[PDB]
Amino acid sequence: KSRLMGLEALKSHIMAAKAVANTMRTSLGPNGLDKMMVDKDGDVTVTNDGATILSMMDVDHQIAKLMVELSKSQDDEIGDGTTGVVVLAGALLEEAEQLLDRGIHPIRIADGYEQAARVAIEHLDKISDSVLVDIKDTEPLIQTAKTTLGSKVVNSCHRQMAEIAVNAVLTVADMERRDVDFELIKVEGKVGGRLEDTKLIKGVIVDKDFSHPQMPKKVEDAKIAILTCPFEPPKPKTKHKLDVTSVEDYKALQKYEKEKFEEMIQQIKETGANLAICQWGFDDEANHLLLQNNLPAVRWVGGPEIELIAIATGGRIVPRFSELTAEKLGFAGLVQEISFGTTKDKMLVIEQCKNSRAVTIFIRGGNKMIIEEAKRSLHDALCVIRNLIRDNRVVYGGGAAEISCALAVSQEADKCPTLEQYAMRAFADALEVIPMALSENSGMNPIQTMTEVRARQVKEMNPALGIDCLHKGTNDMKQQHVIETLIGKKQQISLATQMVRMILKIDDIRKPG
Amino acid sequence: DRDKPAQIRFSNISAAKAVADAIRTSLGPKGMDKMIQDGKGDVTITNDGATILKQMQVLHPAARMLVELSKAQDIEAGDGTTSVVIIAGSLLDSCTKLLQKGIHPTIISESFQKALEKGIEILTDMSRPVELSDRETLLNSATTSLNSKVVSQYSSLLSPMSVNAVMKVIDPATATSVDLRDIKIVKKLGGTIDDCELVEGLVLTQKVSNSGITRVEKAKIGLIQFCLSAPKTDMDNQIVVSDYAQMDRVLREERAYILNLVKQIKKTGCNVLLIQKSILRDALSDLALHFLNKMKIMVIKDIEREDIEFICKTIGTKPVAHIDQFTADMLGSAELAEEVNLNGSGKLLKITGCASPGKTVTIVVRGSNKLVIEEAERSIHDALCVIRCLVKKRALIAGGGAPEIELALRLTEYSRTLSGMESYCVRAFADAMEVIPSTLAENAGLNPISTVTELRNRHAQGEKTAGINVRKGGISNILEELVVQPLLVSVSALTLATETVRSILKIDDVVNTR
Amino acid sequence: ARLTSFIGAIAIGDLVKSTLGPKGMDKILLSSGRDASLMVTNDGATILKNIGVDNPAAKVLVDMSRVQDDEVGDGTTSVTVLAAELLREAESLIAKKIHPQTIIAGWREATKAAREALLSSAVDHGSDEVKFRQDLMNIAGTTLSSKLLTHHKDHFTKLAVEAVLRLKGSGNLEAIHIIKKLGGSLADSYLDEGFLLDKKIGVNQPKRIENAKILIANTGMDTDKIKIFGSRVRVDSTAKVAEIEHAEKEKMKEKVERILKHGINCFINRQLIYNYPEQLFGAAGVMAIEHADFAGVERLALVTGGEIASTFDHPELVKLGSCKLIEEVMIGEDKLIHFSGVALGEACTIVLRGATQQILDEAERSLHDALCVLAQTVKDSRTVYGGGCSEMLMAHAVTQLANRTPGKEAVAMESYAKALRMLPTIIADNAGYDSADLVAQLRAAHSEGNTTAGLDMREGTIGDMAILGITESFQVKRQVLLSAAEAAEVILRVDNIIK
Ligand SMILES: Nc1ncnc2c1ncn2[C@@H]1O[C@H](COP(=O)(O)OP(=O)(O)O)[C@@H](O)[C@H]1O
User: Fold this and answer.
1) CA-to-CA distance for B111 and B108, rounded, in angstroms?
2) Are residues A247 and C240, on separate chains, in Cβ contact within 8 Å?
3) Which residues bind Mg(2+) (chain A)?
4) What gap in Å lies between CA A42 and CA C487, rounded to an integer?
5) CB-nearest partner of A245 from C100, C102, C235
6) Which CATH fold topology does B5-130+395-514 show?
C-alpha cells in the first residue's frame, strides 16, 4: 500500500467530486426527467428528489460519504433545493483546481471564499423587498401555491388543499406568539377517494382496523370516558396462549368473561359511562363475544396511543377501580364513528378540545406515486409557509440573483492587493452555472440566453430578468408571480461555503492507500 | 427475424430425417434384423418397428411428435405402423426443396390438404364394397383375410381358435365394435391346447380351501373390501417377556380379539369372504382359519385390480367399503360352482353364470412349455383386431405398390389439370408417393427403377394390372394370391401423416425455454 | 450511452410479432426442471405470462400489458408492437441530436389529433332491432376470427349471442357464469333455464326431495362456538379420547336434531363436513352437500337476495329463498344437480362438450367483450370499421396536421405517423401477400377521398368494408392508443443509468 504524496490526491478528490456532481447536474429544475432506482429485488421506482436519490447511493470514497452526509444533515431548513448546492460545490472545486495549477496555496482561496460569500450575502440582503402586509400574504396565496406545487401530479389546479394547509398554520402561528412547532402538525396518508377530498382534522383522528364489516355495528354514544383500571381481562405485554393444564377451565373462563361483561355494562349503565377506553385489550374472540349481544365496544388499544386519549378529553385518570363517580370522568361533545367508504372499518374524530396540539391533514389517493408526490408538495408548502411566517422577506427567482451577486462582487473587488481578485472572481464566475443548466435542460441555447439577459440587466435597472422554463411570452419575473425565500438561499450559500472550505482544508495524505 | 426460424426449421427437418433413416430396412416380409444393445451389455435381436421405436430414447420435439404419431396410429388402426414414418420423411424432404425456392407455408399446407382430400376420395371411389349381414360372407372374408398373416402351419393351427373367436356374434352389424370393452382372455398352464371352449360367467384358478364338502350356491363372490390385516404393534417388545403374565396377554390378543370381529361379521347371511393380493400382509393367523373352518368355509386369494373390475362389470354390481355398513347391497348370483381339473395339473374353476345381465364371454386357452400359448394369444389378438378393422367399414383393396402408383399418377394429372401456383406444391406430393414400391423392389432383390417404370407403364396402359410379388419373385397378378387389406389402414394413415406434417410445418419462430 | 433499456424493450416486442392477424404463427414453450413439457400456443398473453425477464423497462412493459389485458379484452400484442415501434423511432430521433421535450410535445399533438379524428369519425345508424342484431353478429364474427379454426364457429357464435342477449340491457356481471366440462362432441349444445353444480356426493343418499326451500345454515362443528359441549385433553392417561369422541358425537347429534326440528329437506353448505356427520345425515334422510366452490353459493344468494348466516348469528334475520323443481337428470357423462322451476332467467349456465381444451378462456373473453359493448352502446351505438381503416385515417390526419406548425416538433409527428402505418403491413406479411403494394394502394385510396377502403384476407385484394360486413368496438382502439402513448412517454423519459 503506497502513500499518495504530492498533488495527485487533490486531483483524484476533485475528479471524484466532479463525477458525483455530474449526476445531480443533469436533473435540475421542473423540466428535469424522472430518475429511476432499483434495489436487489424487482422493485423499480422513478422519482426526482435530491435527498431520496442521495440516500440510497453507493459510493466507495470517504469524500463522497462526507459530502452526502453533509447534504442529508441540512435539509430541514431549506426544504427544496438540495440539488444546486452540489453543482455549485463542483463548479467551485473545478475553479479551485484550475487556479491551483499555477502554484497557489489552497489556504489563500479558502480564506478568500469566506469574504466572497460574506459580500455576496451583504449584497443580497440589500436587493429584496419588505412591503408585505396582511394582504400581500393572503391574496397571492393561489399564485404561491401554484408556483410551489406546479403541474406534476395533477394537471389542473388545487385550491382546497392549499387553503387547508394555510389555515392549519395560521391557526397555530399567531396563537403561540408567532411561533410554530414541527411536532404539532402531522401528515397522514391512506388510499380511498380522490385527491380533491382533503380534510383538516381540528381534533385527533384515530383508526381501529376492524376484522369483519358484516358484523352489526350501530352508533349510539354521546360521552367519552377514559379509565386506567382493567375494564377487561388485560394482556401484560405477554403473548398468552393455552397455558392451562385443564379441560374444564375454558368454559369457566368463558362464563367469567360473560359475567365480567354483564357487570361492566351494568356499572356503565348505572353510572352513566359509555365508550370507556383503557390501556389494555384481549383477543378477537372476546371482542366478537362482546359485539354479538348488545352495547358495541371494541378493545385492542394497547401502545402509546392512549397518550392522545389522555389529551383529547380534558381531565385526569383514576388510580383505583373502586374510585369512580359521575364527576371524575370527562364530558364530551360529539364523539361518534365516521366511515366514508361504508364497507371498511370505522374512525373516531375528536371534536372537543381546549387547545390545538394534534391538527392534521387527510388526503385520499388511488396509487402509490401520486400520494407520495402530494405529500411531498404538502411538506414543501408547509416549509415555505413556515419560512414566510418566520421572516417577511422574499426575493425573485429564475437566475438574476447569481448574476447580480457576481456583478456586485466584481464591482466591489476590482481593487486587490495580491490575492483579493483571483479567488473572488473564481467564486463569482462560477455562479452562472445554475441558470445555464436551467436553460440547457429545456430546448434553448444557454449561452446566448445568458448573454442576452446579462446585457439586459447591465443596460437598464430593475434586476428582475431571467429565463422561462414554461415557454411563455416575456422573460419577466414580477409578472409570473414567481417568488423564492431568502433565508433558504442564505442557508444554501452558507452550507456550500462550509462544504467547500471543509473539502479544501482536509487534503493531506490518506492512511489506506 | 428470418435466419433463426429458417435454421430452426432446417434443424427440425434434419432431425426428423435422421429419425426416419435410423430404421428403414424392415418393411415387408423379407426385412433385415437388428440387434439392439442394452446399457448393461445385453443384446436383443428384433425386427419390428414398433419395438425399436418404443425402446430407444431421444430428447427432441420432432422425435417426440413422431413417436406420438406412431403410437396413435398403432392404437387407432393397429397395422402398418412403419410406413407413416417414411411418408412423413418423404413429405418433409419435399417441403425442404419447396421452401428452398421461396414459397409461403400456407399455400403448401393448402396444397397438401387438397392432395390428401383428392387421394382419399380416389381411394374411396376405387375400392369395392362387400357384404356382411349373413354369416357365410363374413366367414369367407375372415378365411380370406386370415390366410396371409403368418406361415402356413401356424395359420392352420390358429384356424380353430380363429373360427371360435369369430363366432362371437353380439353386435347386429353396428357402426363401431366393442371387442376391446368386454374381453378378458386368460392364460392357464398345464394340459392340452386342444381343450378350448368359450366360457361365460367367471374363471378363477385359486384353491378355496381343503376341508370336507364345499359345494354350495351363496352368490359365489364375497363383496368385501375392508381391511383384514392384524393391528401392528408400536415396537418389538413393549415390556420384558419371560414367564406368564405377558404370555397370557398376547395369547388373548391373538385368540380373543379378531375372533370377536369374525363373529360380528359372520352374523350376516352368505358367509363368503376373500382378500386381495398378499403383497402387504406379512403372515395371516392360522387360528382364524381354523375357527372359520366350521359353518362353511370359503376364501379365495390372489386377486388383482383387473379381476375386480371384470367381476364388477360382468355381474353388474358396485363394491363397497368402510366398516359402518348396515345395508344389503353385496349379494350376487347363485347357480353352480365347485369345479375339478380337466384331466391334468393346475387348478381352475369355471362358472357359466346363468341368468345374468352381462353376456360377456371369454376364451380359456392352454398350452405347454410356454411356447404355443403366447403364440396363440398373439394370433387370436391379430385375428380379432383385423375382424374389428373389417367390421368397422366394408371397403378393401390389395397391396403391393399398385395403389401408390395409381395415386401418384392421379395427383400428377390433377396438378397438370388444375391451375394456380399451388399446383407445383401438389407436384411435390406426386414425388412423395413412389417410396413403398421402390423399397419393396430393393428389398426383394431386383432393379427398383426399372420395376417402378414398368409398373407406371402398366398402370398408364391397362389401368389395373399387377404389382410386386415376394414369394415367386416377379410381377404377377394379385387376384390369385389370397392377400388383402382394409381401406382404413391407408386412409387413416394418410390423414395422420398429413396432420403431423401440417403441425410440424406450422410450428416455427424461436423455441424459448425456462 | 442509452441503448441497453431501449434494446431490451424492443426485443421483447418482436417475440410476439408473428402472432398478429388471423393467420398467425405457432410456437412451443419447452419447460425445464424435472419433466420437460410440450404445448402449442397461439396467443401472446400466455407467452408473456409464462416468462421471466430482469430488465426494468421490460418488467414495466409486461406489467402494463397485464393490466391492460385484465382491463379490456385481448389488448396485449398490438400495444406491445406499437410501443416497440415508437421506441425504435424515438431512438433514431434522439440519435439525430433532438431534445426529448420536442419529441414529447409532437407525440402529444399527434395523439390529440388522432383522438379528435377518431371522435369525429363515428357512425350512429342503429334505430332498429335487426341492426343491433347484425352488428353484434359481425362483432362476434370478427372477434372469433383470430385462430382460423373452421369447425364449429357459427353455432357457438349464435349460442353466445343468445346468452348475452337475454340480459335485456341489465348491468350485471355475477349472473351469467360459465363452467369447465369436457367430454362428448363439438356439435353438442345443451340449453337450459338454470345452472348446475360441479360435484356430487354419490348416489347412496336419497334423491327424492319434495318442497324445495333453500336454507343456508352456517353451523360449524369445529369452529368453537358458544357453550362447548366437549372439552380438551389432559395429561394423565389415554382414556379421555373416548370421552372427547362421545362428546363430539352427542354434540353433532344434537345439532342434527336441531336442524331437523328447524325444518329442512335439502341441506346445502360450503364448510368441511366429516364422514360421520355425512353418514348420519344420509341415514336420517337428508341429503348433505359438501365441498362447495367459492362462487357457487355467492352467485346463488346474489340472484335471490339471500346471504350467508354470518357463521350462526341471526337465524331469524337472513332472508332465504325457495325453488319448485329440483332433480338430478343424467346428462352428458356426469350427474349434476338441476336448478329449474324459477322465474329469474338472468343467471344461466350453458354446459359444453367436445374433446379439446383452452376454450373457456376465449369464451369468457368473448362474453366479456360482448357484455361490455352491450352496456356501452345501450342507447348510443358507436362502431368503426376494421381491416386497417381507422389507422390509415389517423395517420392521414396526423400527416395533414403536421404541416402548419413551424418550429421543430414536426419530425416527431412524422415519425408517429410513420409508426402508425405499420400494423396493416405486418398483417399482410403474416398471410403471405405483397404488403408494400397493398399499403400503397390503401394510402392512395385514402388520399384520393375514400374513407371506406380496406384489404381482404380471403383473396388479397382491396375492397369496401361496409359491403362485406365487418366492424369492431370503439373504446378498445382509444384505450389501446392511450396505453401505448402512456407507455412511450414513460419509457422515453428514462435515459440515465440503472441505479
Ligand atoms: N404376401 C405379401 N405379398 C406382397 N406384399 C406383402 C405381403 N405381405 C406383406 N406385404 C407387404 O409388406 C408391407 C408391410 O411389411 P411390415 O412392415 O413387415 O408389416 P407391418 O406393416 O404390418 O408392420 C406391406 O406394405 C405389404 O405391401
Assistant:
1) 5
2) yes
3) 80
4) 19
5) C235
6) GROEL; domain 1 (1.10.560)
